[PDB]
């Protein structure tokens, strides 16, 4: 698996639609593309798409961030706790 | 280099070592323990 290159393609793919959408800014955390958001709303994402292939039989992973006055919050849970093993 | 930084780095390091997925999980399990220990 050439994960670093797939992530990078996705990072360019990410900046492409952040600009279309634009509260918290659209952002790329180096794992996930976060569609920009209003203060007070919560965005869920799933584990990176690579894992659909790496561990096919596991698909319950969710990661959340809140958009606050102080910008995006930390991931919850952390990517290690929600997408690692 | 924060929790998220280390997970991305973990992914790419393990994805390069492992050629079977169960090797991948193991290297990834190890990368989580390094993260918690640190």
Swiss-Prot record, chain A:
Tissue spec: Most abundant in the brain, low expression in the lung, liver, thymus, spleen, pancreas and placenta.
Coiled coil: none
Residues in the Extracellular compartment per record: 3-85
Organism domain of life: Eukaryota
Disulfide bond residue pairs: 14-33, 24-67, 47-83
Outcome (variant: residue 74 to R): Reduced affinity for ADCYAP1
Cell compartments where the protein resides: Cell membrane
Residue positions with a glycan: 30, 66
Family: Belongs to the G-protein coupled receptor 2 family.
The protein's name in its UniProt record: Pituitary adenylate cyclase-activating polypeptide type I receptor
Organism: Homo sapiens
Gene (name only): ADCYAP1R1
Shown stretch of the complete protein: 23 to 136 of 468
